[PDB]
Amino acid sequence: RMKLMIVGNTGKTTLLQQATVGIDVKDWLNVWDFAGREEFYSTHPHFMTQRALYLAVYDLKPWLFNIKARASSSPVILVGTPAIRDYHFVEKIILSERKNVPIEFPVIDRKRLLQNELPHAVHFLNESGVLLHFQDPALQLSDLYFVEPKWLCKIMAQILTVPKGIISRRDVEKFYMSQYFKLLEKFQIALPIGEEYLLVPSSLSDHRPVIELPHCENSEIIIRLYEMPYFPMGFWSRLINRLLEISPYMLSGALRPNRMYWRQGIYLNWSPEAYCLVGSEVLDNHPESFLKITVPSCRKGCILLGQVVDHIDSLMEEWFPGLLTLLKKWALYSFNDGEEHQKILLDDLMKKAEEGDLLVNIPISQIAPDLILADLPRNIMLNNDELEFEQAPEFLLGDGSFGSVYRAAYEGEEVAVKIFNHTSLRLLRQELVVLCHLHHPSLISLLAAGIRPRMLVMELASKGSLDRLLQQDKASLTRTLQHRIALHVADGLRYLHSAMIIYRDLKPHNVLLFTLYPNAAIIAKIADYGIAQYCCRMGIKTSEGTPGFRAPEVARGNVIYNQQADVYSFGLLLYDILTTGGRIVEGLKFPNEFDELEQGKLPDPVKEYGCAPWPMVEKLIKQCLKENPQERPTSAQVFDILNSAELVCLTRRILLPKNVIVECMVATASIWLGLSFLDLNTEGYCLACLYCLLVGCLSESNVMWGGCGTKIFSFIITVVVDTALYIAKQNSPVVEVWDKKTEKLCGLIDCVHFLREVMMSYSGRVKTLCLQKNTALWIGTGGGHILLLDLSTRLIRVIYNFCNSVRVMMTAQLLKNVMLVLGYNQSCLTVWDINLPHEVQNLEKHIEVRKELAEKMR
């Protein structure tokens, strides 16, 4: 029905009559008596929900922060010993089925065996105390339906009750098991640090050690204060997890530092000149909570001051809204390095840093080097004299999330300048996370970054954005170019996702084209990091993205999502690339319905927009547009699917009816079958041994050859004629080569060896051959394997995973030559682009050239 929650410090269980290790539940009203110990605080922000009445026992506060974070409106009642209301002191059928849970551990994978209903019915039940289905994409545990929620609350913090605060996995195991270790980390209870050790941020040492960190003088350290009224519920578990997962990449961007933990604070040190002491502080006569950050006042010690500050500021934008103001940032400074530090508000010091980088009664570059961006590389600092920038509508390029890209020229080159409109330094520095520290041939390159006008200077895309290409010039979107656009964008996502960064808005407007030459090394780049954020391991919570270009789990802001939200965005981008304008053009002509169908009721691309069919990409779109984010392939797999020449050159995959078993076929665009008929345009369901009219193995290249029995005649399955003589017999895994001039065997070709090199499945029995003028030979093996071999050097690629046994191979004229192949599986009439042997080499060279470029930039 409706559930009640009793929250408060140690001083609850006794009050429940009308030592609490857990959130034990004794329903009458459904009570959720919490734990007052400070050790359990980090794990149960999650269990506070909207449909609950809150009771507080202060006895004779961080609790209300998350009370007014999951739901602003809540009937909070206070008793003794921001919605205060008292100071007295002292889907219905599934509920019955879910009540009975006769299992060992109360977890059920799916309700189908036990039993738009499910997904919504469970949420209402989840809002009650019947069961806990977290179903958040980040947690990756939506397949677990936790019945008897009192079990989950009880045995999930038993690790912290059974040096001071580190526990190994084996000790927990020595006390259906891998899911337990996932629950521990995903609730910020026991996060891994080593291969066999769990940190357990809670229940660490209560008091910090005695640290004699090398630099003690005022002129050798930089101190940053983060005064708060109180530490938000489970703040340090979030911060410690964030700081030990970025530690190897905090100076270089992989140097593992020496780390210390005391449950409020962390000490990272790479050297006596490169350390960082993030830790809580307690000032006398101050009822506040501080967060001191001490770093050395050197070049290598300023770099990771702006790293820690960026990772703490971001950690409150996505995880602790409300502190942003309750939280005020100070900056300790002292003129003579013998006196006591003095503090100035970081906002007040930002005003003095906008007009001259000096502070008068010492430079600002040592008080707070991150407001003047003095910690980012010295080569990306704006020289305002060499900037010819106008800010006129005639020079407007695009409108970014928070700025407006204008055209300008910097250092003589013609570049693009972004002006932040009303904004803060955080927006400039949040986008600076990706522009520097990450270099890739598929990410826009930053040339300079100013602070006085607060602009970014990116390189200029020669040919504009992809959105204009789709909507204006549709004639230049060749099939070999719009594949490279998707390949380059998928490579950009792969680097961003591998670098802890979720991009959030991937749309054609943010895809920049530097050339329309299909064979160039760099064609597409992704720009605009306005909403890119760190997705550390805990996912992201805040929801951003343009409607119609975002994942379904992003439109609904209640869940916390992960980097898989960009794969769905990529699936829509590749959906638009395949359909050119298509949905986007209709989207601007139908507002508030562009995101209505994303849901995800996207129609078939060929059926509606009438594009040229592209198999293995329509399949890729279908498996990227998955409602379940776990079913979507990762960005490292989307690139791997796109990085294949069989995907590019596969044109038609007509599927014949069941058990038709066609054995002969001839071309004419329509294809004949045998007697049947098939039209390529509408896909509507020996011939002209025979030759077109010799009647039988006949080929010519006017010299004509033939084959009968086990001998070759001129005036055994197939006869292939070239400068040499290629022929194979029935059930012959080897193809022999002959010479017309000598009438003698000149070597043999064995397909089994080629198949053996690639890691009775592999038939290898030759069933047909076909030759192409590009010194490449097509061999049809007994399985679903196709061998491409040079005619001169005598392997290109082995084509597989499209049928079960290739029957007949031939070349036809579609205005494009195609190598249409018929094979059994059910039988299918596969059609391949004749340039497949070339595209295997061109794409192989293209990846290697870009691979060298990626190492070159870093």
Ligand X SMILES: C[C@@H]1CN(c2cc(-c3n[nH]c4ccc(OC5(C)CC5)cc34)ncn2)C[C@H](C)O1
Ligand Y SMILES: Nc1nc2c(ncn2[C@@H]2O[C@H](COP(=O)(O)OP(=O)(O)O)[C@@H](O)[C@H]2O)c(=O)[nH]1
Q: Which residues are annotated as a binding site?
A: 8-13, 397, 399-400, 403, 405, 416, 418, 458-459, 461, 465, 468, 509, 512, 527-528, 608-631
400 binds ligand X (CB under 6 A): yes
- Output Rg (C-alpha) for the chain, integer angstroms: 33
C-alpha closest to that of 320 among 69, 553, 7, 536: 69
465 binds ligand X (CB under 6 A): yes
| Whole-angstrom distance, CA of residue 437 vs CA of residue 499 | 10
Residue of 1, 18, 73, 90 that binds ligand Y (CB under 6 A): 90
Q: String of b and e for 487-500 (b: at least 16 CB within 10 Å)?
A: bbbbbbbbbbbeeb
Please report which residue ranges of 155-282 form alpha helices under DSSP H: 169-173, 178-186, 235-245
33, 505, 576, 833: which one is catalytic? Answer: 505
Closest separation between CB of residue 21 and ligand Y, Å? Answer: 8
The nearer residue to ligand X, 187 or 406, going by C-beta atoms, is 406
| Whole-angstrom distance, CA of residue 621 vs CA of residue 571 | 5
88 binds ligand Y (CB under 6 A): no
Residue of 198, 323, 405, 840 that binds ligand X (CB under 6 A): 405
Q: String of b and e for 197-216 (b: at least 16 CB within 10 Å)?
A: ebbbbbbbeeebeeeeeebe
> CA-based angle 31:37:41, to the nearest 5?
75
Half-sphere exposure of residue 568, counting CA atoms within 13 Å on the CB side? Answer: 29
701 binds ligand Y (CB under 6 A): no
531 binds ligand X (CB under 6 A): no
Running DSSP on this structure, what letter comes out for residue 186? H
From residue 509 to residue 528, the character string flagging contacts with ligand X as x (rule: CB under 6 A) and all else as - is: -x-x--------------xx
From residue 6 to residue 45, the character string flagging contacts with ligand Y as x (rule: CB under 6 A) and all else as - is: ----xxxxx----xx---------------x---------
81 binds ligand Y (CB under 6 A): yes
Stretch that binds ligand Y, among 5-13, 297-305, 329-337, 430-438 (CB under 6 A): 5-13
417 binds ligand X (CB under 6 A): no
The nearer residue to ligand Y, 13 or 498, going by C-beta atoms, is 13
What backbone phi and psi angles, to 5 degrees, belong to 489? -70, -40
| Whole-angstrom distance, CA of residue 271 vs CA of residue 35 | 41
C-alpha closest to that of 302 among 290, 313, 292, 294: 294
244 binds ligand X (CB under 6 A): no
> CA-based angle 461:467:470, to the nearest 5?
115
> CA-based angle 791:782:723, to the nearest 5?
20
Q: What single letter denotes the amino acid at residue 560?
A: I
**Partner that binds at residue 108, options ligand Y, ligand X, none, CB closer than 5 to 8 Å by kind:** none
C-alpha to C-alpha distances, 428 to 6, 310, 425, 438, 451, nearest whole angstrom: 43, 11, 5, 16, 9
Annotated active-site residue 679? The verdict is no
Closest separation between CB of residue 43 and ligand Y, Å? Answer: 15
**Partner that binds at residue 784, options ligand Y, ligand X, none, CB closer than 5 to 8 Å by kind:** none
Half-sphere exposure of residue 664, counting CA atoms within 13 Å on the CB side? Answer: 8
Annotated binding site for GTP: 8-13, 608-631
Closest separation between CB of residue 12 and ligand Y, Å? Answer: 4
Q: Residue 743, class by beta-carbon neighbours within 10 Å (0-12 exposed, 13-18 middle, 19+ buried)?
A: exposed
Residue of 172, 233, 303, 458 that binds ligand X (CB under 6 A): 458
Residue least distant from ligand Y (Cβ): 36
**Partner that binds at residue 460, options ligand X, ligand Y, none, CB closer than 5 to 8 Å by kind:** ligand X
The nearer residue to ligand X, 465 or 772, going by C-beta atoms, is 465
In this structure, are residues 656 and 826 in contact, taking their beta carbons and an 8 Å threshold? yes
**Partner that binds at residue 81, options ligand X, ligand Y, none, CB closer than 5 to 8 Å by kind:** ligand Y
493 binds ligand X (CB under 6 A): no
**Partner that binds at residue 13, options ligand Y, ligand X, none, CB closer than 5 to 8 Å by kind:** ligand Y
| Whole-angstrom distance, CA of residue 502 vs CA of residue 757 | 39
DSSP assignment string, 271-306 = ETTEEEEEEEE--TT--SBEEEEEEESSHHHHHTHH
161 binds ligand Y (CB under 6 A): no
Count of residues in contact with ligand Y, rule CB under 6 A: 10
The nearer residue to ligand X, 405 or 650, going by C-beta atoms, is 405
398 binds ligand X (CB under 6 A): yes
Count of residues in contact with ligand X, rule CB under 6 A: 16
Tokens of 260: 């210390």
Annotated binding site for ATP: 397, 399-400, 403, 405, 416, 418, 458-459, 461, 465, 468, 509, 512, 527-528
447 binds ligand X (CB under 6 A): no
Site of interaction with ligand Y (CB under 6 A): 10-14, 19-20, 36, 81, 90
Site of interaction with ligand X (CB under 6 A): 397-398, 400, 405, 416, 444, 458, 460-462, 464-465, 510, 512, 527-528
Q: Could you give the residue numbers annotated as active site? A: 505
